[PDB]
Design an enzyme around this catalytic site. Structure first.
Site, PDB file in Angstrom:
ATOM      1  CD  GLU A  11      -3.237   0.860   0.581  1.00 16.91           C
ATOM      2  OE1 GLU A  11      -3.465  -0.283   0.107  1.00 16.91           O
ATOM      3  OE2 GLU A  11      -4.072   1.797   0.554  1.00 16.91           O
ATOM      4  CG  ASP A  20      -7.207   8.984  -2.015  1.00 16.59           C
ATOM      5  OD1 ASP A  20      -5.996   8.668  -2.021  1.00 16.59           O
ATOM      6  OD2 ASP A  20      -8.074   8.394  -1.330  1.00 16.59           O
TER       7      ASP A  20
END
Length: 210
Positions: A11, A20
């Protein structure tokens, strides 16, 4: 080697706050924090994180010069975002217990991570689709299942009906062949390969070196 090193590799671990490409603020290992001139006036006045006054100054600036709809609507959005980031930092500060200014250390990221794992397992054990396969797996294979949950959510993982069943039946090589045929595998091959190798072997070998 353990589950936190696994998801740190797969990750990634951010010590600084990141926004994001779909708009969420995150930090650590996938720890989520917070969730013509006519349209110029409209959207400025509808930005969810402005003050009364912060908005007054933008709205009245537009009145003063309606031509600059392009720049004032640009300013207004900068502000709205500056605030969301503020909210996230605030949300982070309650989590860490100090004024981080949107920056943490690894042990703090690990602390966040460990409870995130607790959340996922809780979810998993409440999901009738994921529970029986998860109970059936050993600790390291469970790490691979949790790993998948981190990347795509309880629901997505829970939609791997067949591979899930093969996993539950300890048919590891069948299972590995079936996961490879997936859209997941095709979207993130290098990661899916490591996860699938973990499912197949029950070992950490796919992360040795690297």
């Amino acid at each position: 080697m353990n589950i936190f090193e696994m998801l740190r590799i797969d990750e990634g671990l951010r010590l600084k706050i990141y926004k994001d490409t779909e708009g969420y603020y995150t930090i650590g290992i996938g720890h989520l924090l917070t969730k013509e001139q006519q349209n110029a006036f409209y959207e400025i006045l509808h930005l969810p994180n402005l003050n009364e006054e912060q908005r007054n100054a933008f709205i009245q600036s537009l009145k003063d010069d309606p031509s600059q709809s392009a720049n004032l609507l640009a300013c207004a959005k900068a502000a709205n975002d500056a605030q969301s980031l503020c909210a996230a930092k605030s949300e982070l500060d309650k989590a860490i217990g100090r004024n981080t200014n949107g920056v943490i250390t690894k042990d703090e990221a690990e602390k966040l991570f460990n409870q995130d794992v607790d959340a996922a397992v809780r979810g998993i054990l409440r999901n009738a689709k994921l529970k029986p396969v998860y109970d059936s797996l050993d600790a390291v294979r469970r790490a691979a299942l949790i790993n998948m949950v981190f990347q795509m959510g309880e629901t997505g993982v829970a939609g791997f009906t067949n591979s899930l069943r093969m996993l539950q039946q300890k048919r590891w090589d069948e299972a590995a062949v079936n996961l490879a045929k997936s859209r997941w595998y095709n979207q993130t091959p290098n990661r899916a390969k490591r996860v699938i190798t973990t499912f197949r072997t029950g070992t950490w070998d796919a992360y040795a070196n690297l």
